[PDB]
């Protein structure tokens with residue numbers, strides 16, 4: 522099966538979510554050596570804001586698109602196709618300014634596509650991604666899960682994933698990382714324990 | 722006083738939030754002809770993703786910055802300064818894929834600045850923007866305020882605004898816009914009634 526490994530942290534080697542997302546993927550490869558991994562670093566190679574141009578490009582026939590429109594259309598196509606092909610997705614999801622990074626939301630905007638990851642039916646919208654397994658690697662400076670301050674982060678992500686039909690979701694969490702070295706170390710240690718004994 | 726008018730819709734003349742944000746500002750000008758308006762269309766002139774480069778530029782002395790770093794630093798400075806100067810802010814805030822547009826969040830990332838719009842104290846973080854009035858123009862295809870599906874939209878915005886100390890907040894809402902022409906028309910009519918009789 523195909524595993525898509527997504528990072529969105531802007532903090533590079535100092536990133537908690539990049540460390541933990543890599544650790545989930547390493548654990549996964551060890552548990553299933555046949556897994557095929559595709560990597561996408563949404564911070565290193567940022568996806569353009571979903572724009573009026575994105576919409577115009579989508580509604581313009583390929584043979585009449587200019588270069589900028591071909592760019593937007595290919596960006597939309599390649600991102601969507603990579604997600605559709607994936608059987609499992611590991612997503613690094615920092616909390617920056619009370620929500621996810623715009624680098625991550627820009628990816629979400631390309632994968633939330635009517636007719637592909639969800640569809641409209643006479644009975645209402647139906648998610649089409651129910652076969653996909655997702656591991657969300659959720660990292661934050663504070664501890665606000667289950668509280669209003671956390672609305673834009675895990676709650677939002679759960680809404681999006683639920684809408685496209687994901688039912689098989691695990692959250693690997695390391696929160697309170699800004700409260701000092703000992704608290705940061707334990708939060709990461711606990712997340713590693715989840716990876717080691719509660720994922721596979 | 723200085724009013725900052727922000728739009729983030731990608732739908733141009735078909736935008737509900739651009740129509741209503743303009744109507745709030747027109748009403749404001751009529752109520753207070755001395756108000757000075759500054760406009761920023763975050764969709765037409767999109768702010769770069771808040772990135773590793775943004776952080777590096779901020780920590781690099783001006784005299785050693787290269788051109789790309791001067792760009793990031795000026796973008797950060799001009800956006801922040803415009804917000805600090807504003808006494809009132811009218812913000813067009815569509816719901817796209819269960820949250821705000823990345824164009825709007827990229828602005829939030831430049832205005833959430835320690836020491837400027839909030840500060841760390843020995844007693845915890847304190848918002849510094851309590852004198853500012855904000856009118857949020859909230860538009861959505863569905864009706865999900867007060868429900869989990871709405872977490873990434875108004876709930877998130879209220880968290881951000883509360884953190885930087887905004888207490889004087891009004892929300893002008895037009896939701897259910899995707900459910901048909903009559904429902905869209907009434908939602909906009911109700912929002913116009915709020916503007917006419919419940920804002921000023």
Ligand SMILES: Cc1cc2nc3c(=O)[nH]c(=O)nc-3n(C[C@H](O)[C@H](O)[C@H](O)COP(=O)(O)O)c2cc1C
Nearest residue numbers: 530532536537538615616617618619660661662663
């Ligand atoms: C630009 C920026 C914004 C942040 N905003 C928040 C925030 O709103 N709430 C919070 O709890 N932590 C916040 N943090 C702390 C991060 O959530 C924390 O450092 C986490 O480890 C980020 O994941 P990462 O290390 O993989 O980048 C922010 C950090 C940065 C760099």
Ligand SMILES: Cc1cc2nc3c(=O)[nH]c(=O)nc-3n(C[C@H](O)[C@H](O)[C@H](O)COP(=O)(O)O)c2cc1C
Nearest residue numbers: 730732736737738815816817818819860861862863
């Ligand atoms: C790319 C895109 C994504 C959208 N996602 C949502 C959504 O998640 N939930 C919703 O209720 N409406 C959604 N809508 C509908 C918009 O919220 C609605 O059209 C609203 O009027 C947008 O504000 P605007 O007209 O100022 O652009 C979406 C519209 C677009 C174009």
